Amino acid sequence: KPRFPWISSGSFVEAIVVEGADANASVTGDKNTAPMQLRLTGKVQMPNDEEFDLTGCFVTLEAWGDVSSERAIVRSRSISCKLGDDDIDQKIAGHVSFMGKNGIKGEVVMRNGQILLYAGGAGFLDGIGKGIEKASSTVSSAAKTLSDYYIKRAEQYHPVIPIGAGNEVTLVFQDGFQLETLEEARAKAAARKKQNQ
């Protein structure tokens, strides 16, 4: 029998986020993502009231944003842990749930304030100019150009989700796997490469 018990799907464990990232909560969030990393602080809960001890192990993540629910959807990248003299480093799949719900709750921040105020002021100058430009018998250009430029410049910004510091979160292993040491991995790889037919 192996020293590492099999990890079944749906096993969960709580943890503390070490360093946070700002989620690119745009329409293309899932492509241009920002990594983040968290440390374990509990014992993994196996499904039938079973526990295994992984603590202080690091998990590398890779997350984006979702503005509709203002929660930062994560995607686990790798598991890292160094027990005693042996080393663990594997690729796993999972997510993080905060306060009993998927993702991590947070607020949205935008930087359009001053730029939008300037654009509105320019267009207001356009409106007053066109109003004066009406009274006749039987400024607008500066406003239109600067308003177009300000709109094009302010369009660059996108919602950002600030998540990090030392909040409490919970990690879930969406797919089951088997923990195995780096030396064990290299021994297997060599055995497979041997083509022992």
Binding site: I16, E19, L40, F98, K105, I163, G164, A165, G166, N167
Partner: peptide
């Protein structure tokens, strides 16, 4: 919601 308390990630490892 979460509270970003401008806390250095070095202390975050110590806190955990």
């Amino acid at each position: 919601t979460t509270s970003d308390t401008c806390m250095t990630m070095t202390k975050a490892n110590q806190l955990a």
